[PDB]
Write a protein that binds this ligand. Structure first.
Ligand SMILES: [K+]
Ligand SMILES: [K+]
Ligand SMILES: [K+]
Ligand SMILES: [K+]
Ligand SMILES: [Mg+2]
Ligand SMILES: [Mg+2]
Ligand SMILES: [Mg+2]
Ligand SMILES: [Mg+2]
Ligand SMILES: [Mg+2]
Ligand SMILES: [Mg+2]
Ligand SMILES: [Mg+2]
Ligand SMILES: [Mg+2]
Ligand SMILES: [Mg+2]
Ligand SMILES: [Mg+2]
Lengths: 151, 101, 114, 99, 83, 127
RNA sequence: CGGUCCGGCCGGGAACUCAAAGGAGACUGCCAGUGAUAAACUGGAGGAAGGUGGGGAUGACGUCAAGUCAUCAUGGCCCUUACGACCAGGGCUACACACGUGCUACAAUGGCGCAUACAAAGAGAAGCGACCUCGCGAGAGCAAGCGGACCUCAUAAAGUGCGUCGUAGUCCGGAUUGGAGUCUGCAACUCGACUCCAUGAAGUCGGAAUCGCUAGUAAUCGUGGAUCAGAAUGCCACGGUG
């Protein structure tokens, strides 16, 4: 919008672990409004990640997300006759949104036998600093530093 | 609508009352019958085909009363979507007015 | 295993496996298994010979495989010999049951050609 | 026995004054009355294309609201039922009666 | 198909002609417009000229035809390739 | 005597009676855990009594009608909050902060002629 | 509160939901700060609601010689043993192809099977049609009630619990085609809908390109109505999850 600026809509924290961040993650994994399906998938993935890691569920999720949150992104900036890619310091809320989106979209396209297990594997790899979500973060950073000349 | 169409429709409507409104027994009681001999049912089936075809109610078009238009008829009013609105906005219909919700 | 339906079912729940017999759908499959006295969950593996024999005996009560195939063909042949409207639609490879032919009908007509 | 009156009209104010007349004349005639109950307002919705040709999206939407009122005469003495039979109302009201 | 409760349908004005044609032995083709009439067994061996919309088409009632409608043997539309 | 609240959400309406007692909850003569199978509803029905910290000191009898699972859950939360503000008006300033007193007005938007939905427009093509 | 057969079903209450007539409330009204002693902007209190609270109806002067002489009315022109009128059959449903708008899919965030929760809004007399009996089913027989807050249409589906399938052109998908039927109707050949048995295409997320949506919205799941003897994946409405 060009007139307005919008105040954020009220979210409700996750009922089992009390996290609004996990609530956002559920809301991103949700499809067609089937909230409870996404909740079941997320809870199964988190408990299996917990028993793999020897960590609490939110602790394992947080340490995974740490490994994939980007620090910079590339933005198209116009000039009177040209357009340049320029690196921009992405703000933390968008960092979390990006990391969750990348985790979810990476897991979705895995081959493993169920979405809960796909998700658990992708979170393990992310916590292990490996795999598709991490390579996504990585190449974003590569592009940013390759464009650093215009910053 | 072409005046012939109006004459044709009213002819059908009149003719339907002279037969099927009374002789519906021939189909509903006999040609449909299960409790009665198939020879009587067969004879009734053959007899029904002898009634004048335009006497079947299934052949009535149900045209608009004010202009004879076939399409867009509304069964509550007897009028087409056009004449119904013309009467409506002129307030000739006793309780109709524009809705909002 | 193999059945009076000449094919060879294997490694699958009986209620699905029987549906390999040309002429046996899900409800026939269930009727066969009910009359043979076999639980629909049971695999063909670990099925008794005193059970496959009665599966064969029970399937033998239905027209299946070649018996069905030829029958179907014969009926279609008859139409084409009659030269009825359906026979024309059959011989000419067009939809028989009144589907649109302005477009669609592409399963029947086969892949489009300029 | 009771007698029961259902009023239908296309105007809630007309139906109102009809019920007011009923109740006032009845109680003036010594009737016991169980008071006017508003039954749910059955309403009809219509949609019409307003162009003589094409323009499928150009439409008007209309409604008719039928207002209902129920009133019970719980002790209909002869004079009360007679008086209630004698009343006349504006043509916008349909009165339907039962015993 | 017609409800089995009712039995098959034939037009009276055709049946009256099938009768005398059977008495005569199909001496001449029986013209009809009753494309909707069912082929009854008594019709076998007759020739009926069924209307197609612009012409009467000779159908010779073969025994295999019983129970079909006459109109199934008189195609109404002409197609012979686009080019 | 009973302390009362009506609450509603979407098309759902709830009557809530609360009384001093050992924490019992009953909805349409069914247990909370039997009536609602979804944990979100089981949480939101508690939320107000959790924040007031009386879950073990009050019992309540509820009936609820209309709408689906979440509509009825929100209607019950609203009725609970009204009733308990009737029980202790001093809690209103707290419940205002909790946001429960606001009757959530987000009704369903009616379909409109020429649109497939509330706002979904048919697919457009230039040609 | 008494009774109970556990059914608001009974006596009973007018509390509560609701029905629907009338009234109240929102006004930048109040309080800081900014501003040109202005109009108004930022934040706060109270309140169910806060700055057009949400949605609808409401469409200025005029543009496009825009659409309709086939709703209708009308100037002019043309026919008047035919460009008028009646009838049966056929066609508008063709089919080398090309484009638009939709429906169902390509699956495991799923399919199948068993059990069990929670809606709103409409229609009904040439009508809606219960219970019960018959049929695998579509339906048939008998027949109660209802011009309806009463009776019927009519057990919402997504969902929740449990089992099973195991990444397969499959227990995905259900086009096509054979067989047997039901119903409406004078009549289902061309050319109806639906049910049962069998058959089980293409399709594994779609080239250049392109479309909708700012919150109870998109997405997704069911329900009703008009036209209507029968005949919606279209149109007009409703609610669930979100
Ligand atoms: K098969
Ligand atoms: K003219
Ligand atoms: K469609
Ligand atoms: K219909
Ligand atoms: Mg008709
Ligand atoms: Mg367009
Ligand atoms: Mg205005
Ligand atoms: Mg022009
Ligand atoms: Mg013209
Ligand atoms: Mg004709
Ligand atoms: Mg057409
Ligand atoms: Mg696959
Ligand atoms: Mg907008
Ligand atoms: Mg909706």
């Amino acid at each position: 919008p060009r007139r307005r600026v919008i105040g954020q809509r009220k979210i409700l924290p996750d009922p089992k672990f009390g996290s609004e961040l996990l609530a956002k993650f559920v809301n991103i994994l949700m499809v067609d409004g089937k909230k409870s399906t996404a909740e079941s998938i997320v809870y199964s993935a988190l408990e299996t990640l917990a028993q793999r890691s020897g960590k609490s569920e939110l602790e394992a999720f947080e340490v995974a997300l740490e490994n994939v949150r980007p620090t910079v992104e590339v933005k198209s900036r116009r000039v009177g006759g040209s357009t340049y890619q320029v690196p921009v310091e992405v703000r933390p809320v968008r960092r979390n949104a990006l990391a969750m989106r990348w985790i979810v979209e990476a897991a979705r396209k895995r081959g493993d036998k169920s979405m809960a297990l796909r998700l658990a594997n992708e979170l393990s790899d992310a916590a292990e600093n490996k795999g598709t979500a991490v390579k996504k973060r990585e190449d974003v950073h590569r592009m940013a530093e390759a464009n650093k000349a215009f910053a | 609508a072409k005046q012939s169409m109006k004459a044709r429709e009213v002819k059908r409507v009149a003719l339907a009352d002279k037969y099927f409104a009374k002789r519906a027994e021939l189909k509903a009681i006999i040609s449909d019958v299960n409790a009665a001999s198939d020879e009587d049912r067969w004879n009734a089936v053959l007899k029904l085909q002898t009634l004048p075809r335009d006497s079947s109610p299934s052949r009535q078009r149900n045209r608009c009363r004010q202009t004879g238009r076939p399409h867009g008829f509304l069964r509550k009013f007897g009028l087409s979507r056009i004449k119904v609105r013309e009467a409506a906005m002129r307030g000739e219909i006793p309780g109709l007015k524009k809705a909002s919700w | 295993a193999r059945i009076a339906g000449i094919n060879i079912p294997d490694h699958k729940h009986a209620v699905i496996a029987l549906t390999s017999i040309y002429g046996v759908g899900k409800t026939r499959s269930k009727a066969i298994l009910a009359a043979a006295g076999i639980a629909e969950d049971v695999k063909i593996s670990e099925l008794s010979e005193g059970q496959i024999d009665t599966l064969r005996d029970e399937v033998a009560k239905f027209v299946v495989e070649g018996d069905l195939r030829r029958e179907i063909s014969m009926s279609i042949k008859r139409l084409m010999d009659l030269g009825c409207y359906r026979g024309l639609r059959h011989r000419r490879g067009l939809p028989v049951r009144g589907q649109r032919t302005k477009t669609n009908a592409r399963t029947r007509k086969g892949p489009r050609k300029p | 026995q009771r007698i029961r009156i259902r009023l239908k009209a296309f105007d809630h104010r007309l139906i109102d004054q009809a019920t007011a007349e009923i109740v006032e004349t009845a109680k003036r005639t010594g009737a016991q009355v169980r008071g006017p109950i508003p039954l749910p307002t059955r309403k009809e919705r219509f949609t019409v294309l307003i162009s003589p040709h094409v323009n499928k999206d150009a439409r008007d939407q209309y409604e008719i609201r039928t207002h209902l009122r129920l009133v019970d005469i719980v002790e209909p003495t002869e004079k009360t039922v007679d008086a209630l039979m004698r009343l006349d109302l504006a043509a916008g009201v349909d009165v339907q009666i039962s015993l | 198909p017609r409800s089995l409760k009712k039995g098959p349908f034939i037009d009276l004005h055709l049946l009256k002609k099938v009768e005398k044609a059977v008495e005569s032995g199909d001496k001449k083709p029986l013209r009809t417009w009753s494309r909707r009439s069912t082929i009854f067994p008594n019709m076998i061996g007759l020739t009926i000229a069924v209307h197609n919309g612009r012409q009467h088409v000779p159908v010779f009632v073969t025994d295999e035809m019983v129970g079909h409608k006459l109109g199934e043997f008189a195609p109404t539309r002409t197609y012979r390739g686009h080019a | 005597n009973q302390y009362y609240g009506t609450g509603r959400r979407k098309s759902s309406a709830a009557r809530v009676f609360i009384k001093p007692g050992n924490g019992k909850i009953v909805i349409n003569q069914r247990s909370l855990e039997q009536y609602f199978g979804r944990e979100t509803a089981r949480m939101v029905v508690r939320q107000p009594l959790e924040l007031v910290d009386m879950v073990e000191k009050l019992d309540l009898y509820i009936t609820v009608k209309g709408g689906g699972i979440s509509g009825q859950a929100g209607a019950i939360r609203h009725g609970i909050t009204r009733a308990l503000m009737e029980y202790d008006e001093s809690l209103r300033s707290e419940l205002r902060k909790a946001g429960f007193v606001t009757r959530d007005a987000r009704q369903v938007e009616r379909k409109k002629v020429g649109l497939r939905k509330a706002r979904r427009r048919p697919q457009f093509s230039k040609r």
